[PDB]
């Protein structure tokens, strides 16, 4: 209750209870004035983009909070403390608070900005808790809470895309006016609070199977089911076709009757990190996996949950099948290989296929005395009955949830970037400086306003997600593989600040370090 | 060493149907084998060679005569073993 | 409860009850912005220091309060009132308060600083009451409360050093992010208060033993225990070796069987205050006492509690065995002898040895008819059973407590600079200006912030330590030696201000003036 | 480079007392220094050399004349720097 009183305190705890962990995080924000308070439409006809890159939409002056990355809540020690002894985690409830609002206003009088504190100006905040809006969150954008808590961040701008016939607007293209929602006027003494409880989303499997899928049998006893071992008796001269069956196997494990199947597949392209073993074309977009939706092509990227490469093929990666997080000194256009972080995905080699590899070979023809048994090569495979797979790993950088789109049907709604597919996700919290106009003229005018006071806000924002942990129940004997720091005389400590204060996350940390048997 | 074994050494393909497979994928080791390498000794020309650096062959367009390929495997660490195959192709 | 209301009053009492003394002190502080809000690491590789002077650490923008000197609580009259009639004192509890916060913000517009009062900006304060941080306090640094109450002081900057392989960083080097602790946002109307209760630390012995340790016998009666007086009978010609024992002693006091032992010793170097009786080398660091810890040498300084010199040897002092407090007009580099205050430590000559003297002589060989009884010279001596000693004196300038480091074992945890070794010391109170950013650009940017508003805080801070006194119980007849002011026509009054207001403490005041018998 | 500095370069030792220390332990670096190495340039013979591969010297039995030692430090990775010292020993 201002003005000479703080409207909230700085909470940045991370408490570890028995079966639940409460990760509070508080950041300092700064909201500018976007579009100079206008609902300017955005399309592709101004730039003139490609046929698959046409869009049509609107760009509000509202701004949103997107706490939809894992490092907005977990410090790297808390992430290490989680992923080393937990077979799973899911969020229970969140608790969002927005306090200590300061509405400054800047005067650029004669080339000198004189930022002056304004006290009567307000700030509109609403949480779209009924989902009437486009849900831009979960599209893996920037403008989150920063990783390191001592960073002032800048709030994104809420734009949205709707239906288009190219860069035109079909009569189904919805326009959303966001002052047509009840917001909350916040002076410099008020605060925005709300609470939210997640669904019963499944636990994210933070373990790696210590058994293969085609290695789920007793290596000593042989089976009681037979199979065809041989369609040609070797009588040392020529063909006989005596159809020899025999029991097995203790040793011929590749031919036994299994019981389950590996997961779906959709092949990406095998691309070497070493530049000398790649084709001299371009490539991408020529030999990439892509889909036609309304007559425009889009790369799958990263596709279904598949392993990255085979055993000891660390140089290869799927062309668009991996999360590629950028480092610092990495621009937003044509960065080299060193300044990115390709997340190697290899802990799911047991159940899931390899994204650069076929998912088996079906037969084509009918074998007879006349025609040889030709087999065809399978590349894409929809889900058969009896397939098991395991979803894509999450990361300390990567996204937490996504919105399951409200369609009539959906198959296994896990997001392809990893995370928790939520029907009712955390609602979008949208924020906007109330437009304070400059001096109007003395005679009445019909035209709206071509002059406002240039201003911006700042303040703090607390997000407090309670998670639900799944404690491991292992009877493994030998030690696990756990995420450790590199014990060496190092030049700089990883996941810390530098000589001039730049928080640099050095590597992507997954969550699959423990071993449950399959 | 790296021990290799070919599918039969001796095949019998009847004309006109020329589409066979030499399966050098039953070649064993005590560790993994890094690659399988196919070559050729005998035979005339004009064949569509498909994936000589792989396991299962896909042979097409075979002139009736005598072809002779050769499989060579490489262990980690490197060790070679060349076992050959004969293609008795007759009408 | 501001803004037009003070959030606390100025308390600077010092009340003397029967067995306890409550010394309140309130100062005005000023907290700047350090590092421009960055966790810049600090190491030795930038400067390139010596092999024993390599370090590695971090330098936060936080600032700490260090009320860890005795004159932050005791006026020189209250110190005199304490040390003259008290055989001991220890603190019971403290009470820390932080009020009347004013957050100014400075605009250096065209070379003219225009300091403007800001009302909505906050100040983060937390007391690290669980000891997760490096405890920099007790390292005898500057930036305390000032001695004289009418002084505005400037808050230190909280940096910390961790493990290094030179100027590298081993994988045990911890990084502490200090916004990952729950702070308390304080506007211009709020106040930070907490309370703390000390442990049952022993009383600091503020007395000097009026008996020696080797003079603890009745000077009239002789003992009943014998000893060897003579290994050579004088029959006026030559050696006889008749092994003459005889009783004693009333007079041969140096040879009697004593019962206890003087304390441990570790010799420093005998250095004259008169420059003509010193070696012409340098010296120090050539003939100093130093220890190897992880392969790097460090001067002991001031070492174990030992006396400074013998009887009437005031010109000598141990090279690093004395507290050397600086006066004013004393720089932080290569100051002469006049501008410092070497604390003479001579009241503990009874129990403790002399730091420039050997602690006795052991024997080396076996005496026989063949070999003479050669004796070796003892210099360093660990604690034998039966040693008594007395800890180092405290001063009006010197530190109050220190933190006993959380190791598996420690022997007699008194700090070598004197004071109260506390397992759980008073917690570090860390303070930091909340970063208020300048105007962000209109398009969203990923990079954090290269521009903040330059600001600083000011305010008052009260520290109120309740002490527990040990009233003397003496039956001494003759008067004691007590700390008196020099009664003379003086040019300036000691422990007061000057012609232009500089509070100058003229001399270090110990606490050992009273006499308890040993 | 590996920068080294000797205690003074110039000492003055009075006879008969010949027992000095050259302290090449204030030699700096940006990393650790692996070893300190002492050598000798000038001077007569018959001295008791003690620990030339260490930091702090312990020099004894010095003829009045001109001794000249030399400290050499080695960084990781290897880099040398030779700074010398003069021993103006006079009666």
From Swiss-Prot, chains B, D:
Compartment annotation: Cytoplasmic granule membrane; Golgi apparatus membrane; Golgi apparatus, trans-Golgi network membrane; Cell membrane
Posttranslational modification: N-glycosylated.
Tissue-wise expression: Expressed in cortical neurons in the brain cortex (at protein level).
Domain PKD: 3-91
Chain positions carrying an annotated carbohydrate: 66, 81
Quaternary structure note: Interacts with RTN4R.
Known role: Possible role in axon guidance through interaction with RTN4R.
Protein name per the record: Dyslexia-associated protein KIAA0319-like protein
């Amino acid at each position: 209750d201002g003005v000479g009183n703080a409207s909230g305190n700085w909470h940045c705890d991370s408490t570890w209870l028995g079966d639940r962990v409460i990760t509070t995080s508080t950041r300092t924000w700064a909201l500018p004035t976007y579009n100079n308070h206008l609902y300017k439409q955005i399309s592709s006809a101004s730039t003139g983009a490609s046929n698959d890159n046409h869009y049509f939409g609107y760009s509000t002056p509202w701004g949103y909070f997107d706490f939809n990355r894992f490092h907005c809540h977990f410090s790297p020690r808390d992430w290490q403390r989680l992923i080393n002894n937990n077979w799973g985690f899911r969020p229970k409830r969140l608790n969002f608070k927005l306090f200590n609002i300061q509405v400054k206003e800047v005067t650029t009088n004669d080339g000198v900005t004189t930022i002056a504190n304004n006290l009567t100006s307000t700030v509109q905040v609403f949480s779209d808790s009924e989902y009437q809006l486009p849900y831009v969150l979960g599209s893996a954008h920037q403008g989150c809470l920063p990783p390191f808590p001592a960073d002032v961040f800048m709030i994104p701008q809420y734009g949205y895309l709707t239906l288009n016939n190219g860069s035109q607007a079909v009569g189904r293209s919805s326009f959303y006016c966001l002052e047509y929602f009840p917001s909350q006027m916040l002076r410099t003494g008020n605060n925005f609070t709300f609470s939210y409880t997640f669904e019963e989303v499944p636990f994210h499997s933070s373990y790696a199977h210590s058994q293969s899928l085609d290695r789920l049998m007793n290596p000593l006893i042989d089976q009681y089911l037979y199979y065809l071992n041989r369609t040609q008796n070797q009588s040392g001269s020529a063909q006989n076709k005596d159809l020899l069956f025999s029991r097995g196997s203790p040793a011929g494990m590749s031919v036994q009757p299994k019981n389950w199947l590996p997961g779906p597949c959709y092949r990406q392209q095998r691309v070497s990190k070493t530049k000398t073993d790649n084709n001299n074309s371009n490539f991408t977009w020529t030999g990439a996996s892509k889909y036609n939706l309304n007559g425009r092509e889009s790369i799958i990227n990263p596709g279904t949950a598949m392993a990255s490469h085979k055993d000891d093929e660390d140089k290869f990666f799927p062309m668009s099948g991996v999360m590629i997080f950028g480092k610092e000194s990495a621009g937003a256009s044509n960065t080299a290989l060193d300044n990115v972080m390709i997340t190697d995905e290899e802990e799911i080699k047991a159940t899931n296929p390899v994204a650069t590899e076929r998912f088996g070979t079906v037969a084509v023809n009918f074998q007879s005395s006349s025609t040889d048994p030709a087999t065809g090569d399978v590349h894409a495979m929809g889900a058969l009955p009896g397939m098991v797979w395991q979803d894509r790993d999450v990361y300390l950088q990567g996204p937490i949830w996504a919105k399951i789109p409200h369609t009539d049907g959906h198959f296994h709604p896990s997001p392809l970037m990893g995370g928790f597919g939520l029907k009712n996700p955390p609602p979008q919290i949208l924020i906007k400086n109330t437009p304070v106009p400059a001096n109007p003229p003395a005679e009445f005018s019909a035209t709206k306003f071509a002059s406002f006071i240039t201003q911006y806000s700042t303040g703090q924002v607390s997000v407090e997600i309670e998670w639900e942990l799944q404690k491991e129940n292992s009877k493994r004997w030998n030690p696990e593989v756990q995420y450790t720091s590199n014990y060496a005389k190092s030049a700089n400590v990883d996941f810390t600040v530098d000589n001039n204060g730049l928080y640099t996350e050095p590597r992507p940390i997954g969550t699959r370090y423990l071993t449950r048997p399959l | 060493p790296p021990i290799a074994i070919v599918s039969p050494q001796f095949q019998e393909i009847s004309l006109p149907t020329t589409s066979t497979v030499i399966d050098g994928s039953q070649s064993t080791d005590d560790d993994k084998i890094v690659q399988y390498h196919w070559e050729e000794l005998k035979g005339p020309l004009r064949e569509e060679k498909i994936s000589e650096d792989t396991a299962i062959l896909k042979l097409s367009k075979l002139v009736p005569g005598n072809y002779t390929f050769s499989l060579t495997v490489v262990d980690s660490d490197g060790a070679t073993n060349s076992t050959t195959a004969n293609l008795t192709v007759n009408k």
